[PDB]
Design a protein around this ligand. Structure first.
Ligand SMILES: [Mg+2]
Ligand SMILES: [Mg+2]
Ligand SMILES: [Mg+2]
Ligand SMILES: [Mg+2]
Ligand SMILES: [Mg+2]
Ligand SMILES: [Mg+2]
Ligand SMILES: [Mg+2]
Ligand SMILES: [Mg+2]
Ligand SMILES: [Mg+2]
Ligand SMILES: [Mg+2]
Ligand SMILES: [Mg+2]
Ligand SMILES: [Mg+2]
Ligand SMILES: [Mg+2]
Ligand SMILES: [Mg+2]
Ligand SMILES: [Mg+2]
Ligand SMILES: [Mg+2]
Ligand SMILES: [Mg+2]
Ligand SMILES: [Mg+2]
Ligand SMILES: [Mg+2]
Ligand SMILES: [Mg+2]
Ligand SMILES: [Mg+2]
Ligand SMILES: [Mg+2]
Ligand SMILES: [Mg+2]
Ligand SMILES: [Mg+2]
Ligand SMILES: [Mg+2]
Ligand SMILES: [Mg+2]
Ligand SMILES: [Mg+2]
Ligand SMILES: [Mg+2]
Ligand SMILES: [Mg+2]
Ligand SMILES: [Mg+2]
Ligand SMILES: [Mg+2]
Ligand SMILES: [Zn+2]
Lengths: 144, 150, 129, 155, 81, 87
RNA sequence: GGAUAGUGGCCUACCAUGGUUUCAACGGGUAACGGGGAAUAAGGGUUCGAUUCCGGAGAGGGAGCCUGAGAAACGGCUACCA
RNA sequence: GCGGUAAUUCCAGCUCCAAUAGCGUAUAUUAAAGUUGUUGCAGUUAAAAAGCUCGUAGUUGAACUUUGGGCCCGGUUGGCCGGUCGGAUUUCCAACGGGGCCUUUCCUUCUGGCUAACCUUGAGUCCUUGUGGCUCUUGGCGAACCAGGACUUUUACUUUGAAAAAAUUAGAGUGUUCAAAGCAGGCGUAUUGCUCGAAUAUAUUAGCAUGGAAUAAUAGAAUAGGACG
RNA sequence: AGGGGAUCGAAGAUGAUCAGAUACCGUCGUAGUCUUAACCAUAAACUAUGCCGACUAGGGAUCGGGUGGUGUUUUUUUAAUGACCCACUCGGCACCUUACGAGAAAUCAAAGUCUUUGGGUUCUGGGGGGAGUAUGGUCGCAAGGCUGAAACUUAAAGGAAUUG
């Protein structure tokens, strides 16, 4: 019968054994170890809002050649420092150091996105506006 | 098959369909029930009796010509031993392996063979003691076993 | 060692049919084996069978026609409650129009439609199509 | 458990409100009270014949039996006038459609009208709280020994 | 093969099979009556000895054991039943 | 394979192997139909009259087509001995 | 025996050595109030339930208590900590 | 994967596609996933059989003990007629279930309370030539269950049922103008009221109550300390 | 820790070879190699293939047991034996041919009787790297053994077969 005990009274062994091997599942492990709450820059939160420290041109990975224009951010609920990409041509002229940006994930489940090494996040809003609006024209950056 | 090795061999008696008979055997129930006792009175084991009465005498199987197996017949006449015969012959064996092992500590093969014999003793006994032939808290111990067999 | 005597019966019968034979010798029969072989034969999936008497547990010579695709035993005898017989037949039967799950009720060994008519339930033995 | 002395304790052991007038001369000494618990449990002769007191006895005592009636097999006779029984049962786990062997241990008071040995199946019946743990009282011994005199010597 | 009679097999090919692989198993060993004209009467012997069987009155010999059927001793006769 | 009211639906009832009673289906091109013609008084094989047998490609591949044919024909009476039901 | 509205190691005195556990005790974690239920539609499942109903717990943290049929109450008091 | 000079992926224009009062992104979770596998995975070489045997807990564990036969009773579909002023039941009929008998057959057991049932029959007869049919007390059924005494091997499974909150869910009725909903509403003499509702299902593991006796455990009589009286 | 220490020989030193040559080749030769007492517990400890049971297919060898024969060879006077020959039967170590069947294939009498999915049971795996690393526990004189993560990284890594 190769392995699994087929007897009628083997339930205990059957759940114990399945309870064991669930730990080889990456997601079950992550969710029970609380890796969300423990590790990771966001708390497990959808987004997080930090403050811009420096502005980095990031050198893109092969076989691309480019400069990816990110921002070092210090999460306000954390103090955890995070580098985050600024999408959409321009938009690095939209930020500034000490500006207050709201970052989201990249939609890789952690996991840096493109040719951009190390960057797990992206900017969404600056100074409480949304880069989108600024990038098109729909809104203007607030005074200070 | 063969709990304590990987030998798969099939060897055994093929017991006749005829559950009575031979009809060429005459004698009587009376005849061999004494014949059993007389040998147990000499000290034979029930197996030694069935073997003996199979060759010199005409006893196909004692169980057919008398309504009882050889061990019940011994029991009824008060001939039954303290421990069953198979248990005895296991313990008798382990006793000699041990005595051999004390004389040679360098024989690792004997140590392994001792464990096996003893593990058969321990499972067999556990059954005999479950079914009341051996009292509960009956135990085999090498310290006391060489007196048990002799 | 032999954990289901029904099992080795049904398997050997299936290796007959698969290898194209007309008869099979099964060992060591049983009460459960017989009433299983009866439920098959009374819907026609095997022919006449003969219990032979060794002074041991028995033997059977089954004659089979070849109408039989598969017979098999559900090895833990699960308990079925009267509305889960739907879910058993649905799982292992080729289609709703034929073939039977045969199970063990307190009303005795009987196929699933006889069980549905007599409205008794129980554990599950096997199936035949 | 008990076993003899009857009178060994700092307090006089008696039955409540069962008076024997010393003026009236009696050939039984003490007058003794009892009842039937109900439900069909024979109030055993060792309760009516006995001299023990045990106000926790279901026959000669002040406890009533009501609620659950259970059976378990005696796993411990150690503490005085009380025992622990194991009750096995199989627990159904639906996802695997199978069962697992479980058990509980039920502490229960046993009057010294029963001689309980370990291994005995015993019928037990519910109670007002007798102690911190014991909620049940031993009402019948369905077992005996299981071949005690079949443990004897050779031919 | 592919069809045959398992209920009534030929007595020739049942004769070659192992004693447990026949249709209803039974022994292949027989009993015999032996005589050595020194002695008038006849002991009954199992074909497979183990014990080396001595006759009724005189200690003589009858058969020595083997891995199998016993070799009978020297001048002797036997019937079978 | 009938329908609601009586009507035969589902085209093409297949053949069946004569030894095993198992369906012979379109793509079995190892199957066979052996036509054995009836005879009459003093020789004379009678064209257009047969006793026919159909053996599935399975049986032919397993080497049983010959011995299985003996049993089949002899039981229909066109062989006398050659085949023994016992072994 | 005392205490309770009352059963009970509830508590005390005297006495005993008991009770639980691989059928997982005990301990740890829980970004844990439990339930009715929610999301996902072959079935089997997986995941979730702070939250309109039921039950429980609480009133910054602890403890204590008056009144009273009923509170160890906090839109009651008393004390300590914050 | 596109961008290093004619870029089908960038920045725009035109045009086009999908969804549309909504559409995109992030995070979580579910399906896809038979990548957690009871149903249902895989492990020679892709991840994976412990160097080897022993072995406790655990899981598992051959076959066999009332099988077969005879009769009775009454049910629910369905056939061929319909008798009838869409539905009706008797005779003919198969089929499928239920109950109870007798075959060597505890049905726990006495001690009466009870009787509904015929071995009864006491009269004979409505009526088809009579076992088609039931009223009807005077010898002759126990179990249908009252209640008292005296006792009872333990279980698992399965059946039916009770005890059961509502909202949720499944679902019937009702035209909230549709619908999500709601539990309303629908009828006249709309001048003096009439009237259907406000179902049903699930609700399991445990406990309780009832039927079944296959499957699977358990106990029994061997120093007879057996069973009956 | 004693003994033994012929041989071969981690280390080391040498002669060469090399651009270099800490090596491959030659020389010397410590430990070791053998043994007793005690540790260690690991190998590609491999059939890279758990165990018990059943069933499914042919063939010729062979090892062990047995059975059958007016078999051969052994001479003596026939035997008895022994070795041999032939047939059958158990139980082995394997090969051969088949492929109903299985597989991604290579291949496989199991690696078959598996979407027609349930005989009993133990164990291990869940993309690659991180890494058998860290950490705790535990065993050991030690070398190390058993147990054994995560952060982060990453679109492959990998298996068999084909053609180049
Ligand atoms: Mg792992
Ligand atoms: Mg920096
Ligand atoms: Mg904070
Ligand atoms: Mg075997
Ligand atoms: Mg073993
Ligand atoms: Mg091996
Ligand atoms: Mg005590
Ligand atoms: Mg006290
Ligand atoms: Mg909390
Ligand atoms: Mg919760
Ligand atoms: Mg809640
Ligand atoms: Mg929860
Ligand atoms: Mg919270
Ligand atoms: Mg506050
Ligand atoms: Mg505090
Ligand atoms: Mg307060
Ligand atoms: Mg307030
Ligand atoms: Mg308040
Ligand atoms: Mg251009
Ligand atoms: Mg464009
Ligand atoms: Mg299942
Ligand atoms: Mg897989
Ligand atoms: Mg590998
Ligand atoms: Mg069995
Ligand atoms: Mg009654
Ligand atoms: Mg060197
Ligand atoms: Mg040099
Ligand atoms: Mg070189
Ligand atoms: Mg290893
Ligand atoms: Mg010869
Ligand atoms: Mg790439
Ligand atoms: Zn003699």
């Amino acid at each position: 019968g190769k392995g699994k005990p087929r007897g009628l009274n083997s339930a205990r062994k059957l759940r114990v054994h399945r309870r064991n091997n669930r730990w080889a599942e990456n997601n079950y492990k992550k969710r029970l170890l609380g890796t969300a709450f423990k590790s990771s820059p966001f708390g497990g939160s959808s987004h997080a809002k930090g403050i811009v420290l420096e502005k980095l041109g990031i050198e893109s990975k092969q076989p691309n050649s480019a400069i990816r224009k990110c921002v070092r951010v210090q999460l306000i609920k954390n103090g955890k420092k995070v580098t985050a990409f600024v999408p959409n041509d321009g938009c690095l002229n939209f930020v500034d150091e000490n500006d207050e940006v709201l970052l989201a994930g990249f939609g890789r489940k952690g996991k840096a996105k493109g040719d951009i090494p190390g960057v797990r996040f992206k900017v969404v809003k600056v100074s409480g506006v949304s880069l989108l609006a600024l990038w098109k024209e729909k809104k203007e950056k607030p005074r200070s | 098959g063969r709990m304590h090795s990987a030998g798969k061999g099939i060897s055994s008696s093929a017991i006749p369909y005829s559950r009575n008979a031979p009809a060429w055997f005459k004698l009587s129930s009376e005849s061999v029930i004494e014949q059993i006792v007389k040998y147990a009175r000499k000290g034979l084991t029930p197996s030694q009796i069935g073997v003996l009465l199979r060759d010199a005498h005409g006893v196909t199987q004692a169980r057919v010509i008398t309504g009882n197996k050889i061990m019940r017949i011994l029991k009824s006449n008060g001939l039954a031993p303290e421990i069953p015969e198979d248990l005895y012959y296991l313990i008798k064996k382990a006793v000699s392996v041990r005595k051999h092992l004390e004389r040679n500590r360098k024989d690792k093969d004997a140590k392994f063979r001792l464990i096996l014999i003893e593990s058969r003793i321990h499972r067999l006994a556990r059954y005999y003691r479950t079914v009341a032939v051996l009292p509960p808290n009956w135990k085999y111990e090498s310290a006391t076993a060489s007196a048990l067999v002799n | 060692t032999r954990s289901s005597v029904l099992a080795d019966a049904l398997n050997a019968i299936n290796n007959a049919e698969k290898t194209g034979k007309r008869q099979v010798l099964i060992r060591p029969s049983s009460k459960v084996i017989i009433k299983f072989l009866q439920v098959m034969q009374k819907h026609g999936y095997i022919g006449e069978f003969e219990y032979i008497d060794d002074h041991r547990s028995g033997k059977i010579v089954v004659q089979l026609n070849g109408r039989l695709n598969k017979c098999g035993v559900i090895s833990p005898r699960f308990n079925v409650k009267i509305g889960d017989i739907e879910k058993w037949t649905a799982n292992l039967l080729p289609a709703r129009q034929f073939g039977y799950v045969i199970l063990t009720t307190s009303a005795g060994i009987m196929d699933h439609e006889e069980a549905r008519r007599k409205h008794v339930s129980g554990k599950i033995l096997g199936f035949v199509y | 458990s008990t076993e003899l002395t009857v009178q060994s304790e700092r307090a006089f052991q008696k039955q409540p409100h069962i008076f024997n007038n010393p003026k009236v001369k009696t050939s039984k000494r003490t007058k003794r009270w009892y009842k039937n618990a109900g439900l069909g449990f024979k109030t055993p002769k060792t309760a009516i014949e006995g001299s023990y007191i045990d106000k926790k006895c279901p026959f000669t005592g002040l406890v009533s039996i009501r609620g659950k009636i259970l059976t378990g097999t005696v796993v411990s006779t150690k503490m005085h006038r009380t025992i622990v029984i194991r009750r096995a049962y199989l627990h159904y786990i639906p996802k695997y459609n199978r069962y697992e062997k479980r058990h509980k241990n039920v502490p229960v008071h046993v009057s010294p009208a029963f001689r309980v040995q370990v291994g005995d199946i015993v019928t037990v019946g519910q109670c007002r709280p007798i102690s911190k743990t014991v909620r049940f009282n031993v009402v019948k011994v369905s077992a005996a020994a299981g071949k005690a005199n079949k443990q004897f010597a050779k031919f | 093969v592919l069809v045959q009679d398992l209920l009534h097999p030929t007595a020739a090919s049942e004769a070659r099979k192992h004693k447990l692989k026949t249709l209803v198993q039974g022994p292949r060993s027989y009993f015999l009556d032996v005589k050595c004209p020194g002695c008038l009467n006849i002991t009954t012997v199992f074909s497979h000895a183990q014990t080396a069987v001595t006759c009724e009155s005189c200690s003589t010999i009858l058969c020595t054991p083997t891995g199998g059927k016993a070799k009978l001793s020297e001048g002797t006769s036997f019937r079978r039943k | 394979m009938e329908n609601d009211k009586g009507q035969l639906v589902e085209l093409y009832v297949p053949r069946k192997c004569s030894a095993t009673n198992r369906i012979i289906k379109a793509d079995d091109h190892a199957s066979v139909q052996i036509n054995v013609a009836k005879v009459d008084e003093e020789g004379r094989a009678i064209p257009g009259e047969y006793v026919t047998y159909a053996l599935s490609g399975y049986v032919r591949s397993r080497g049983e087509s010959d011995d299985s044919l003996n049993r089949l024909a002899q039981n229909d009476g066109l062989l006398k001995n050659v085949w023994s039901y016992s072994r």
